[PDB]
Design a protein around this ligand. Structure first.
Ligand SMILES: CCCCCCCCCCCCCCCCCC(=O)OC[C@H](COP(=O)([O-])OCC(O)COP(=O)([O-])OC[C@@H](COC(=O)CCCCCCCCCCCCCCCCC)OC(=O)CCCCCCCCCCCCCCCCC)OC(=O)CCCCCCCCCCCCCCCCC
Ligand SMILES: CCCCCCCCCCCCCCCCCC(=O)OC[C@H](COP(=O)([O-])OCC(O)COP(=O)([O-])OC[C@@H](COC(=O)CCCCCCCCCCCCCCCCC)OC(=O)CCCCCCCCCCCCCCCCC)OC(=O)CCCCCCCCCCCCCCCCC
Ligand SMILES: CCCCCCCCCCCCCCCCCC(=O)OC[C@H](COP(=O)([O-])OCC(O)COP(=O)([O-])OC[C@@H](COC(=O)CCCCCCCCCCCCCCCCC)OC(=O)CCCCCCCCCCCCCCCCC)OC(=O)CCCCCCCCCCCCCCCCC
Ligand SMILES: CCCCCCCCCCCCCCCCCC(=O)OC[C@H](COP(=O)([O-])OCC(O)COP(=O)([O-])OC[C@@H](COC(=O)CCCCCCCCCCCCCCCCC)OC(=O)CCCCCCCCCCCCCCCCC)OC(=O)CCCCCCCCCCCCCCCCC
Ligand SMILES: CCCCCCCCCCCCCCCCC[C@@H](O)O[C@H](CO[C@H](O)CCCCCCCCCCCCCCC)COP(=O)(O)OCC[N+](C)(C)C
Ligand SMILES: CCCCCCCCCCCCCCCCC[C@@H](O)O[C@H](CO[C@H](O)CCCCCCCCCCCCCCC)COP(=O)(O)OCC[N+](C)(C)C
Ligand SMILES: CCCCCCCC/C=C\CCCCCCCC(=O)OC[C@H](COP(=O)(O)OCCN)OC(=O)CCCCCCC/C=C\CCCCCCCC
Ligand SMILES: CCCCCCCC/C=C\CCCCCCCC(=O)O[C@H](COC(=O)CCCCCCC/C=C/CCCCCCCC)COP(=O)(O)OCCN
Lengths: 70, 104, 53, 347, 140, 55, 122, 56, 459
């Protein structure tokens, strides 16, 4: 009566543990991959991250400059 | 003033038995005190204690002890009948284990 | 830190004075106009880390 | 001072800060610093007395020296590369000059001696302004030039700031000096993580600003500038002293209060690089700030000090001016830790 | 500067003890000079000769602490034939601490300095061996 | 000897003594701008020499 | 160190780009929103307490405004935070895809082939 | 007459209501971890002719 | 497991919305109901834990601790209401609020799946305890005690946090399940040695370890009665629970590392038991006894065997109950005579017979009379230590003697002899105090009736 009224079967806890373990393992792998990607992006600067500003080329004036050699 | 400040004198402790000879030591209000005693005794001894002990005593076997005993009896019966050793020193089949190629 | 109000509104409060090769009066060129012009065009859009190398 | 004049001066201080924060030209940033200082000097002298005059003089001398060093750094950078944009600071000598000048402006150790004196010499409102709003501009510039920073110099100054803040605050009975030393230590904490993550710097600055605003507004609400003056407040407004104690707990860095969030995150960030020893030392040193916060809480809230007779009359009157943002500031300074991931919105 | 640090670190541990002691003395002396400069700046000595005396006292003590530390550490390392062992630096640190205690003429100062300086030097040797970084370069 | 004296002397009392001494050292300044502006000069020179020369 | 400030295509002061409209909005029953409303309620209670008014009953309109303001701000705060985390994941996955040499998927070995040292507890 | 009784003893439903709400929230949390329901190697089972899920 | 967490958060506004003369009744009744609800956690499995969600899980090690906490709350409520009679309504509600917040933090601490959440809650437990000690303590040293209680903890726990985040940068997770399944050995290097020390010393200072225990006599003597009960019953067990959790990542570095802590624990149990023999204060004796028992638990966790773990669990539960009962017993006399000197009031068996019976049962359970769970845990730990090294039976044996001495000494000093002549205000025992003693003592023997419920996951 106690097991029928207050508790479920073992398969519920078993498969819930399966789901929890899968989610946590995926999160751990994602954390490690994110750390590695951050390291590579900061070292090389060839990704969307760690892009530091440079001078805009639209500020350059491409006109004759009163002297032929600029 | 030969004193350092103005303070109340330290009051004497009140005795609950002075106003209520049967006081139960819960409150100075006799009705509130009596009902405090009643609720503590009912919900501590009658509800939590006895019913909780009864609930814990009849907790269903999720630790799987009787199941393990029956499984052990089955295994012992089969191994004794077939002449196999009761327990093996290896819990994993060596066919699935690949030891390193070289030990030198 | 840096709130790019100028870029958001297209205002140009002070960018006209940031570089030597940006529209001087009477088209007077800087002494190192071509070198700056080349460096800016090289380093444009690829980020400071890649530009430094 | 006229209310219109006071409003104009406050707006000029704020406008100088925003000019520093929105500019792309080094000259405009220096101009913003100049305008901010010029408008800030009379605010310190709003209530005239010799102490306020001395504090204003010391503040002016320090900030003028810092601004001159800032201009020198900008000029050297221009000399070695004809660049006016606030960027990676192409010269190392100019970068050392910039770091030292901005540290002097912020009150970082060892350019820290002026902060307790100036805070003690002025009123509580001017101290609030100086210890909250006057940190934004130098920190914004430091965030902008973070890539070219020399980690050794700023890490040395940050550790010195934490150590000196704790040790100096250990000895104070004046509330304004306690606030100044706490500010020095928190400045060290914010500058320690700058070479690694500017988002953590911004988060720490925001939490510190909220906590400092709540603390100063509670100190204004109960007209106390000393420990003994604050020890009378329980006999007049006990809720104020209770909220004060919880705010001091949060500023001490204890979980689950919001003051735990920055240090925690900063420590985590410093362990994403290697950097193991420095966070350990920083936490062990912040224990000193926790100690003198706890001593203040002992004096004001957890025990009852003797009072005076005339306090009875004060029981019959109420606070006329009410600060509208005090409850929200207290709540944000105490119950905000469960919303920690929201910091992703900062970057 | 870092020139003195490199001068000290270039020599192998248990070799050329006199040179290592000389470099440590220089490092100790330099530290003393900076401490005395700050002390005079913040607390004036009321007389030029008194300031010279204070500078000499501080500088001499720092130099003495560094000299004994380096000499004792190198001697222990070469006697035990065990370089890369934090114990040699522990003995050097405690010897420096006892030197400081003798300089100030205090037993408690000597004992505390021995313990703390030995622990600090052993930790420094451990960090040298394992690659611990006080000022880590940003990597991520 | 152990619980009331030496275990107290080593961990908490030594820490309190050291922190109090360092607090007295740090916060005992007369408030004269001359002295700590001289300190500022010393700091600037040391920073220019030790950190700026090593890049 | 600024990670995302220089990310191409970023509008300076937008706080919510159009791309974020492609993500599911937080539910109105999000427990984070409920916590923000709880913060607003706490602010209202403290406001009543400071001004020496009945804490639970003084101003119902003021308490309602507090709760509503906190919820209203929290909704957009959560939207922006979710957008930022989605952007981070997108950039990470794109970078991993475009640099196969840096992220090699090496051979998987069963536990029957790996030699692990055994340390007895005794 | 029950107005006074209720205004005095209405605080006695907060804890049972909290317990019921906690049970409901626990069930809601259980609802989000069904990715391996009737999928583990140990308990994988062909469904009965009428039942839809092996556990809720 | 929100079905237990939410009712406590509902205990909060019920207390703050109660009538001025009904706070104690409501708090006691609903705390008892919450304890009854939490009794359902004892139905544990044999292989894995009860994983309720991504955030909370129940193991066989944490369920008895949760039950002990939820049971202790009504006892502290009953014990506190005597000395807080003259207090105003708002301050009484604040005291009850502090107790409720402490129970909520402990409940959430004992079931957190991640180590960092466990750290945050295990540190959040500090604030209510410090407030209780420094506000509702009686004498002037309480302030100092609070400081000793605070920094002693934080100096140990701040390094741990660093270590924790470092681990998450290396393995990618702090979830206890993933940590257990993906465990890797620790090498013998200085970095690993200091990682071990950072992971261990916080829990060591919480137990506390001998030499790091100076905060405990101060904090437990200067605190009010409920503070003492919660400090001795549950808050000491946080260190043991955390150590048993964290030792899964420290192998095999543990064998080399443990030696100094083992010697400190054994010689310190001897020293603290000896200190209990010459103590003029009644509360300090109980505090030092707690230190001795916790040293035994430290040895049990450190030798790292299944029998040692079962012994540690049983001893932790038994000590919690026994120490709470002893502190309440001492507080009854203190409330009578307003002094803590042990020789001030003598011959109390003549004046208070049933109270003397309670004293006798508590002293009997302190010295581990069989078949009480105190003796079960002690004997399991002793057997494990004997397997570790046959010489330990010396030191443990000496402890088994000295303990009994001081325990009976306490009894003989307080209950036997002749009454003090000039003390003429020993009122008869109230129903509240007798009920408090009975509710302390009956669960102990009931647990003896069924011991597998407190033997931990290694059973
Ligand atoms: C790009 C950025 C870079 C920019 C930075 C670079 C700038 C360079 C340009 C500089 C151009 C110079 C132009 C003039 C500058 C203004 C000078 C001024 O106005 O003086 C005001 C100042 C106050 O004037 P006053 O109040 O009217 O009169 C006060 C009385 O004079 C005295 O009153 P009293 O008797 O009551 O007080 C006692 C006495 C006490 O006097 C003392 O105690 C000094 C004794 C110290 C002994 C010296 C050490 C010996 C061994 C070290 C050798 C090192 C190398 C070798 C290695 C080891 C060798 C074995 O005086 C003091 O206490 C004052 C202390 C000031 C001492 C010098 C300050 C420099 C820094 C502190 C150093 C401390 C020494 C430690 C060693 C550090 C390394 C050298 O006057 C003085 O302090 C003395 C004159 C100093 C001027 C000449 C030196 C200028 C230094 C400039 C930088 C170098
Ligand atoms: C967790 C459980 C509990 C643990 C924690 C609790 C237990 C541990 C902590 C408690 C003990 C630690 C305290 C350390 C010493 C404190 C000193 C002090 O308080 O200064 C302030 C205090 C204030 O003095 P003051 O104001 O500056 O001047 C006025 C003086 O009072 C006026 O002084 P005076 O005129 O009366 O005479 C003083 C004079 C002469 O003193 C006298 O008049 C009488 C003679 C006493 C000296 C005894 C030395 C000869 C006998 C020793 C035999 C060997 C040792 C036993 C081992 C046997 C091996 C089988 O002393 C000296 O000249 C110093 C010369 C150095 C010789 C002694 C140093 C030996 C160090 C031990 C080496 C051990 C290595 C490892 C061994 C491994 C094998 C097990 O100083 C004193 O008064 C005491 C002076 C003597 C202190 C040195 C004694 C050494 C104690 C043992 C050290 C080992 C513990 C630390 C190990 C780790 C270090 C890295
Ligand atoms: C983690 C899980 C969730 C928990 C979240 C955290 C805790 C809750 C949030 C915190 C904020 C909430 C309350 C803020 C305002 C409190 C201000 C105040 O004074 O309160 C007095 C006020 C009573 O004043 P009154 O009625 O006007 O008349 C009495 C006079 O005022 C007589 O007043 P008086 O001024 O004359 O008396 C002077 C007294 C007055 O001083 C105080 O009252 C101290 C209050 C300080 C507020 C806390 C600071 C800011 C928040 C930080 C919390 C930290 C939490 C983290 C853990 C660390 C613990 C510190 O000062 C003293 O006596 C000094 C004693 C020294 C003790 C030091 C300990 C103080 C710190 C304790 C903080 C504990 C947390 C707050 C608990 C609630 C307190 C009411 O209390 C209340 O009545 C309101 C509290 C309950 C309202 C909520 C109930 C909602 C309706 C019930 C139905 C529930 C719905 C369920 C939904 C489903 C439907 C069935
Ligand atoms: C073994 C007997 C079997 C009997 C079966 C039924 C027993 C039911 C007992 C229920 C629980 C006992 C009551 C404990 C609370 C005290 C109640 C009270 O206030 O009494 C006042 C009440 C009214 O008298 P009054 O006129 O007010 O007098 C008050 C004056 O202060 C005057 O007061 P007083 O001077 O009368 O003081 C009370 C008295 C007695 O009071 C107590 O001390 C109670 C606590 C006993 C020792 C506790 C520490 C040791 C822990 C052992 C844990 C065993 C747990 C077993 C499961 C129990 C579940 C509840 O003190 C003593 O006589 C010294 C006790 C020495 C005990 C030594 C026993 C060693 C182990 C025995 C073997 C156990 C296992 C057997 C199987 C072995 C393999 C075959 O008197 C009684 O009701 C009689 C007291 C009960 C004596 C029974 C002692 C043996 C039973 C042990 C516990 C039950 C075990 C049941 C299974 C068989 C064992
Ligand atoms: C005042 C005068 C006193 C003297 C007179 C007394 C009169 C007699 C009364 C004494 C009774 C004698 C006891 C003798 C033993 C009989 C009971 C025993 O047989 O029951 C046990 C059962 O006892 C219970 O299991 C133990 C009680 C549970 C204790 C939980 C405490 C309640 C919660 C309160 C809070 C706890 C806080 C501490 C946290 C850990 C058997 O265990 P078990 O072998 O299985 O049963 C097998 C069959 N089953 C499984 C089908 C049921
Ligand atoms: C202790 C609690 C701290 C709370 C701090 C105060 C909270 C109230 C302040 C309200 C903020 C108003 C901003 C909304 C108006 C729109 C402005 C928007 O356009 O700003 C954008 C950015 O939005 C804001 O930055 C987001 C502010 C959100 C602050 C909350 C985060 C706090 C961390 C978690 C604590 C819990 C919060 C609980 C809330 C009640 C601009 O982006 P960008 O120009 O490119 O970045 C400039 C800086 N860079 C370039 C260096 C990166
Ligand atoms: C490198 C820096 C390391 C930083 C270490 C942080 C230490 C944290 C605790 C700081 C306590 C400082 C106390 C102090 O200095 O004041 C001395 C103080 C004077 O009393 P006041 O209250 O200030 O004045 C009232 C009457 N006028 O003396 C006392 O009585 C102090 C009593 C309480 C302090 C008890 C501290 C117990 C802590 C023990 C363990 C802490 C060790 C910390 C380092 C761990 C080792 C890595
Ligand atoms: C009231 C008493 C409480 C006080 C006790 C506090 C002491 C706790 C023990 C010290 C903890 C410090 C360690 C911090 C976390 C270490 C985590 C870690 O693993 O880092 C190591 C590095 O380890 C360290 O850096 C630790 C160095 C120690 C610095 C701080 C010293 C603190 C005091 C040390 C002596 C104290 C001894 C214990 C206390 C004794 C009781 C008084 C690996 O980093 P990597 O650089 O990547 O190495 C691999 C690649 N090279």
């Amino acid at each position: 009566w106690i097991a029928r009224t207050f508790y479920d079967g073992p398969e519920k806890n078993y498969e819930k543990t399966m789901a929890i373990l899968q989610i946590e393992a995926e999160k751990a792998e994602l954390r490690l991959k994110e750390l590695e990607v951050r390291r590579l992006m900061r070292a090389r600067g060839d990704g969307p991250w760690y892009q530091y500003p440079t001078i805009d080329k639209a500020l350059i004036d491409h006109s004759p400059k009163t002297t032929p050699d600029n | 003033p030969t004193i350092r400040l103005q303070e109340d004198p330290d009051p004497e402790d009140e005795n609950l038995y002075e106003k209520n000879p049967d006081s139960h030591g819960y409150d100075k209000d006799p009705i509130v005190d009596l009902w405090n005693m009643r609720v503590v005794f009912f919900f501590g001894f009658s509800i939590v204690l006895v019913l909780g002990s009864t609930f814990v005593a009849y907790l269903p076997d999720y630790r799987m002890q009787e199941w393990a005993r029956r499984e052990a009896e089955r295994l012992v019966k089969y191994r004794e009948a077939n002449g196999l050793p009761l327990m093996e020193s290896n819990c994993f089949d060596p066919n699935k284990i690949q030891l390193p190629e070289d030990e030198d | 830190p840096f709130f790019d109000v100028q870029k958001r509104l297209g205002l140009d409060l002070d960018r006209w004075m940031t570089i030597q090769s940006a529209e001087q009066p009477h088209k007077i060129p800087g002494r190192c106009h071509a070198f700056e012009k080349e460096w800016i065009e090289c380093a444009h859009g690829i980020g400071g880390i890649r530009a430094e190398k | 001072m006229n209310p219109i004049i006071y409003t104009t001066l406050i707006m000029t201080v704020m406008s100088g800060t925003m000019l520093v924060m929105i500019s792309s030209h080094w000259l405009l940033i220096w101009i913003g610093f100049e305008m901010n200082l010029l408008a800030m000097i009379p605010v310190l002298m709003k209530n005239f007395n010799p102490r306020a005059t001395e504090a204003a003089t010391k503040y002016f001398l320090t900030q003028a020296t810092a601004s001159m060093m800032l201009m020198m750094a900008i000029i050297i950078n221009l000399l070695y590369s004809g660049q006016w944009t606030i960027t990676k600071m192409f010269n190392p000598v100019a970068m050392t000059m910039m770091t030292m000048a901005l540290a002097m402006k912020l009150g970082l150790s060892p350019f820290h001696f002026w902060v307790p004196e100036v805070t003690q010499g002025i009123s509580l409102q001017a101290g609030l302004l100086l210890l909250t709003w006057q940190k934004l501009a130098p920190l914004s510039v430091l965030c902008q030039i973070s890539q070219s920073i020399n980690p050794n110099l700023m890490l040395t100054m940050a550790m010195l700031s934490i150590l000196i803040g704790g040790w100096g605050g250990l000895n104070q009975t004046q509330l304004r000096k306690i606030m100044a030393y706490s500010s020095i230590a928190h400045m060290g904490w914010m500058t320690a993580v700058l070479p690694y993550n500017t988002t953590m710097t911004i988060l720490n600055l925001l939490i510190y600003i909220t906590m400092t605003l709540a603390m100063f507004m509670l100190l204004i609400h109960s007209s106390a500038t000393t420990t003994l003056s604050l020890s009378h407040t329980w006999n007049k407004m006990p809720v104020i002293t209770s909220l004060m104690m919880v705010t001091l707990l949060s500023m001490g860095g204890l979980p689950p209060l919001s003051g735990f969030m920055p240090k925690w995150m900063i420590i985590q960030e410093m362990t994403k690089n290697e950097s193991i020893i420095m966070p350990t030392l920083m936490a062990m040193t912040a224990l000193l700030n926790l100690y003198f916060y706890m001593r203040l809480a002992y004096s004001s809230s957890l025990t009852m000090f003797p009072s005076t007779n005339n306090m009875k009359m004060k029981w019959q009157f109420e606070h006329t001016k009410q600060m509208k943002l005090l409850p929200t500031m207290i709540v944000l300074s105490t119950l905000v830790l469960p919303m920690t991931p929201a910091l992703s919105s900062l970057n | 500067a870092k020139t003195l640090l490199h001068k000290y670190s270039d020599i192998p541990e248990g070799t050329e003890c006199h040179r290592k002691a000389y470099a440590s003395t220089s490092i100790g002396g330099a530290t003393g000079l900076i401490v005395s400069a700050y002390s005079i700046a913040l607390k004036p000595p009321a007389s030029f000769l008194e300031g010279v005396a204070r500078t000499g006292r501080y500088t001499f003590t720092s130099a003495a602490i560094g000299a004994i530390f380096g000499l004792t550490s190198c001697i222990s390392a070469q006697v035990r034939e065990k370089p890369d062992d934090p114990l040699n630096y522990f003995i050097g640190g405690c010897a420096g601490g006892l030197t400081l205690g003798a300089r100030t003429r205090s037993y408690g100062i000597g004992a505390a300095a021995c313990a703390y300086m030995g622990l600090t030097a052993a930790l420094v040797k451990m960090g040298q061996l394992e690659g611990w970084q006080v000022f880590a370069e940003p990597k991520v | 000897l152990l619980d009331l004296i030496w275990l107290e002397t080593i961990l908490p009392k030594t820490t309190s003594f050291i922190q109090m001494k360092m607090s007295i050292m740090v916060s005992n300044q007369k408030g004269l701008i001359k002295l700590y502006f001289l300190s500022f000069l010393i700091t600037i020179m040391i920073s220019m020499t030790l950190f700026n020369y090593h890049e | 160190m600024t990670m995302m400030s220089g990310r191409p295509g970023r509008v300076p002061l937008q706080f919510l780009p159009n791309e974020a409209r492609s993500l599911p909005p937080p539910k109105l029953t999000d427990p984070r929103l409920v916590y923000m409303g709880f913060l607003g309620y706490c602010s209202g209670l403290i406001d009543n307490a400071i001004r020496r008014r009945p804490v639970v009953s003084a101003g119902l309109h003021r308490q309602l405004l507090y709760v509503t303001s906190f919820v209203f701000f929290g909704y957009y705060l959560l939207k922006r935070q979710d957008y930022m985390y989605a952007l981070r994941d997108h950039d990470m996955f794109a970078y991993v895809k475009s640099h196969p040499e840096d992220f090699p998927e090496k051979d998987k070995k069963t536990y029957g082939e790996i030699l692990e040292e055994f340390h007895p507890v005794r | 007459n029950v107005l006074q009784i209720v205004r005095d003893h209405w605080v006695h439903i907060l804890v049972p209501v909290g317990f019921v709400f906690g049970c409901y929230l626990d069930r809601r949390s259980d609802e989000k971890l069904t990715a391996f329901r009737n999928k583990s190697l140990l308990f994988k089972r062909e469904l009965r002719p009428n039942e839809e899920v092996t556990w809720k | 497991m929100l079905k237990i967490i939410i009712p406590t958060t509902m205990l909060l506004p019920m207390t703050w919305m109660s009538k001025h003369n009904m706070i104690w009744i409501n708090a006691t009744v609903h705390s008892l109901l919450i304890s009854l609800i939490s009794l359902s956690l004892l139905n544990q499995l044999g292989e894995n834990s009860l994983n309720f969600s991504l955030t909370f899980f129940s193991d066989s090690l944490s369920a008895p601790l949760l039950v002990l906490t939820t049971w202790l709350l009504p006892l502290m409520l009953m014990a506190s209401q005597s000395h807080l009679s003259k207090e105003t309504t708002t301050r009484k509600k604040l005291y009850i609020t502090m107790l409720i917040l402490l129970q909520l933090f402990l409940i959430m601490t004992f079931t957190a799946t991640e180590l960092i959440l466990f750290y945050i809650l295990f540190e959040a437990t500090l604030v209510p305890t410090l407030i209780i000690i420094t506000r509702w303590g009686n004498q002037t040293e309480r302030l100092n005690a609070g400081l000793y209680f605070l920094f002693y903890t934080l100096a140990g726990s701040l390094p741990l946090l660093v270590a924790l985040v470092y681990i998450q940068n290396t393995t990618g997770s702090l979830n206890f399940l993933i940590i257990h399944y993906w465990s890797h050995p620790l090498s013998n290097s200085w970095s690993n040695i200091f990682m071990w020390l950072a992971c261990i010393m916080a829990f060591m200072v919480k137990m506390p370890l001998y030499g790091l225990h100076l905060w405990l006599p101060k904090a437990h003597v200067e605190a009010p009665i409920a503070g003492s009960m919660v400090l001795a019953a549950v808050l000491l067990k946080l260190g043991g629970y955390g150590m048993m959790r964290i030792t899964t990542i420290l192998n095999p570095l543990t064998n080399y590392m443990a030696y100094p802590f083992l010697m400190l624990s054994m010689w310190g149990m001897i020293m603290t038991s000896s200190i209990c023999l010459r103590q003029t204060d009644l509360k300090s004796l109980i505090a030092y006894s707690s230190v001795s028992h916790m040293a035994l638990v430290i040895v049990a966790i450190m030798i790292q065997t299944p029998w040692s773990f079962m012994g540690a669990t049983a001893l932790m539960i038994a000590h919690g109950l026994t120490s709470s009962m002893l502190f309440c017993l001492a507080n009854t006399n203190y409330e009578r005579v307003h002094s803590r000197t042990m020789i001030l009031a003598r011959g109390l068996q003549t004046l208070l017979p049933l109270m003397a019976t309670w004293w006798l049962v508590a002293s009997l359970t302190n010295l581990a009379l069989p078949p009480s769970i105190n003796l079960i845990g002690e004997l399991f730990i002793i057997t494990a230590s004997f397997s570790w090294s046959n010489i330990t039976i010396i030191l443990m044996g000496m402890n088994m003697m000295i303990t009994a001495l001081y325990s009976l000494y306490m009894l003989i000093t307080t209950q036997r002899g002749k009454y003090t002549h000039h003390i003429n205000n020993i009122k008869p025992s109230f129903t509240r105090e007798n009920a408090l003693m009975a509710l302390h003592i009956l669960p102990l023997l009931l647990l003896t009736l069924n011991p597998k419920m407190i033997l931990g996951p290694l059973y």
